[PDB]
């Protein structure tokens, strides 16, 4: 089920990598049996980093960034949203 995590940036960043499609939209793919448009996901978590401590997990799919729905979003849209805040990031994620 979707959950919200708050992550405070360190000087070296949030401590995770995001990976996913360049383009907008695309074929539906269910995540834990629920239909969604394509989602960007967390492809790495820095051990001991901010994301790790906040409970972000490898493979987490990203549904919202800073209160903005990113279902079907381009990679650039999600990166730009993650970078929107000076030091805080709020994600809605789905663990797989």
């Amino acid at each position: 089920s979707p959950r919200v995590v708050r992550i405070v940036k360190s000087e070296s960043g949030y401590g995770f990598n995001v990976r996913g499609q360049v383009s907008e939209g695309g074929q539906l793919r269910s995540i834990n049996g629920e239909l969604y448009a394509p989602l960007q996901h967390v492809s790495a978590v820095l051990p001991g980093g901010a994301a790790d401590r906040a409970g972000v997990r490898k493979g987490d799919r990203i549904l919202e960034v800073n209160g903005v729905n990113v279902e079907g979003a381009t990679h650039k849209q999600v990166v730009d949203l993650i970078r929107a805040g000076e030091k805080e990031l709020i994600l809605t994620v789905l663990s797989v």
Binding site: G13, Y14, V18, R19, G20, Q21, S23, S43, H75, V79
Partner: peptide, 7 residues
């Protein structure tokens, strides 16, 4: 096509 970024 997929891209990865370090955040």
């Amino acid at each position: 096509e997929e891209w990865e970024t370090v955040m």
